[PDB]
């Protein structure tokens, strides 16, 4: 097909955990969906202690934004590496076929840009990440990863083939960081990316993250930035981890329908308490809220969640159901 005959639509991405506007069931035929991302290397404070790292980002955020298209659309990405950056970057889409997911075609020095097109031939949520030859995990574990959702053209389906329609969607990107430590266990600091590289590699080779965070920082999805829902709403949470396994869990809830490895032609797993998203994967979980209050959404290695940062909150509005749960006798001394 002459791709020039297809509709084009442009999207300006939004910052995670929010997701750009889209339609679950495709309202048009196949399209070329145009996205632009600008790489930004920047300092980021990642913890309550004030630890500051040199992050490598797509569009200024960790994770990079969620892109949403439909099966057999074309994704056309304009990738810009401004001359204010220092490093070489590129992009690999796990949704794409060929050329290392695009990485072989998108190497951009500071001051350069490129435009890649690929056909989104498989439905699912997928990781995308930077992957410059010879320094792949350094870029990924500096925050340079996000996800893309390729919806079936007729939307999501349950294990029986019936429609599933979400009311709200959130994108949780989970990031393992490896801040180098000295003999004393203290964080080390670096003056240039080149002076950082070897100790960054050494720290990565411990296979022990110093931080594991949602949305780029300890506590990022809490407080005024807690996720929200109302009782009775259907919520899809897309969760990615570009480098390391995670095991998401909604404390006080479930995954009613879970694609743990993220690919929508498969039936979902039902009624999950916790699910395994392998490193290098995006998964998706659908839940209908049944109770109000605070929930925690965590990686259920609870050390990873509550000591290293992999925990966020939902604040849910509505009526309490005493049939589902009640305090029969409140805590007391007798």
């Amino acid at each position: 097909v002459d791709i020039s005959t297809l509709p084009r639509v442009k999207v300006d991405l939004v910052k995670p955990p929010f997701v750009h506007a889209h339609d679950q069931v495709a309202k048009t035929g196949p399209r070329v969906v145009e996205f632009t991302m600008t790489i930004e290397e920047k300092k980021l404070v990642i913890d309550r202690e004030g630890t500051e790292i040199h992050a490598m980002t797509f569009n200024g955020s960790v994770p990079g934004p969620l892109m949403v298209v439909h099966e057999n659309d074309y994704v056309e990405l304009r990738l810009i590496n401004p001359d204010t950056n220092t490093l070489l970057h590129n992009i690999d889409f796990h949704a794409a076929t060929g050329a290392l997911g695009g990485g072989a075609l998108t190497q951009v020095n500071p001051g350069e840009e490129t435009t890649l097109r690929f056909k989104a031939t498989k439905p699912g949520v997928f990781v995308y990440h930077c992957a410059p030859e010879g320094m792949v995990p350094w870029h990924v574990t500096s925050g340079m990863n996000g996800a893309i959702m390729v919806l079936p053209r007729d939307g999501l389906k349950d294990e029986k083939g019936q429609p599933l329609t979400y009311d709200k969607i959130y994108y949780v990107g989970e990031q393992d960081f490896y801040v180098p430590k000295d003999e004393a266990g203290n964080y080390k600091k670096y003056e240039t990316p080149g002076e950082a590289y070897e100790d960054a590699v050494k720290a990565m080779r411990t296979l022990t993250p110093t931080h594991i965070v949602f949305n780029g920082a300890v506590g990022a999805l809490t407080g005024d930035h807690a996720l929200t829902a109302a009782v009775g709403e259907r919520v899809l949470v897309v969760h990615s981890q570009a480098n390391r396994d995670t095991r998401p869990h909604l404390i006080g809830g479930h995954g009613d329908y879970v694609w743990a490895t993220g690919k929508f032609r498969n039936p979902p797993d039902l009624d999950q308490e916790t699910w395994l998203i392998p490193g290098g994967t995006a998964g998706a979980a659908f839940y209908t809220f049944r109770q109000p209050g605070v929930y925690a959404y965590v990686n259920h290695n609870l050390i990873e969640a509550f000591e290293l940062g992999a925990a966020g909150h939902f604040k849910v509005t509505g009526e309490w159901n005493d049939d589902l749960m009640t305090s029969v006798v409140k805590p007391a001394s007798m």
Copy 2:
């Protein structure tokens, strides 16, 4: 519904790996199932070396007991924290909906008790664990976790919808402990829980357990406490890990039907050699024994199993089948 109109049944729990009496197919309508657990903080010897830790337990054991109910029963738990304990505790049921699984409603100081009720709306095996705000992984990794099984009212089913009926059930709780180590690699010891806390946190943050055990100690499910079966018996092994991934395997056997993530509305995986139970999950495996002798049941990270403690035994009685396996030429020099 007026819950007061429903039958009540009381259960006194039994110590793992055994499971209180129950019926697979529900012989009554929905019920309120009453359980009582008493929290016990106690010293436990966890290895052959004599390493002694301060454990935090439900009902005196690591893991806590297995509770068994049916879908849409109500679980009513009386949780007692005697004044002989030091710490605040609570309980979160992954089977439950709302209030952080119950944790927000069950905070009990020493000298207090509480009664929680919830509706068991989803069938499966699920983790339960203590989760006091701000010190969650310390309690969990001190042994304060167990599991609950919510059976479908018509019992278990295979991948074709045919009944599966177990003859025996065992509950294996797998516990990761993080005993703090000094520069020399020697275990450190502590005089009060408060003096222990920071080094407990530091040890947890290594993400490297010092011990990984079944039923609370190295070798606990061996010798006079080996699990048992006869050739031809159908055995369900429920396995939980509240904090960290495991990969169970029956050495010399299989999981004929496995719910690796524990939720019975899903078809089981067939013929598994090894399966992944994510941290924060309970799974269940069904096997019909076909050969007698000793089996080892392990986490198949074999270092975790044979060096760190995650190994137990079955002793199986009956007739050897030489069709299935035989020594054609016994080991010899020729």
Copy 3:
């Protein structure tokens, strides 16, 4: 049945990643399939630095060869431990039932041999490994593991029950090694296996591999030993990990049909980007190539892949499809 009435066929195994000749759909009735393996303890250089370890091998390779039979064939293995070796060895087949998978029946000192027969009653890919009582993980993590494929007699099937036929098969064995390190982080060296044992155990207990490799060494499946395919060919990649989780991913491709836990009576997962093979398991992924060029096949913990060794290449021949992917604007300064 009188097994003596069945056909016998002998196989001389081939070195991974290649696989001995076989037929997907069984062209005969059940057979006794005869294999011979000779244990070889040998020095192996495992990295670009020249690090040399004392490996323990089946048939001279890491991994050991892939054996291929059909469901309800009998496997008859002659296992030889020549008197040029130092250690006791045996073999445990995860495909087999009874006697610890064969390990209880196959203990051979140097100078001894044995012949084991078992019935391959379950279809799938399965791990086999050495497992001498008391020193199991040392042998496994010294390279003494491989895999066996038990094909359904009517070959592989998709999620709808339609045939899947591969054109090429490769076997990737992934090995975690634990070379002991001193305080400085330098590798230690040893003069005898007995003098090595305690520090080998200590290194294993870190749960942090020093090396994670395909086919026995960093870069083994690259260069002149890259895997190969043509556009349009259907390739099955069998992947095993006897001790530790992995998460395979074809960079630039997918797993079109994946049995992540390796058992062919289950429907495959479709369209996977990345999949979790638990330690102690073999999995299999089927892909039809659609683009030419270089691919990397990796464990998608990218530190594990690109720093520790778990990366190989495919070189794929054929026509580039610009519909599927194209550079619209090559990298440039504007």
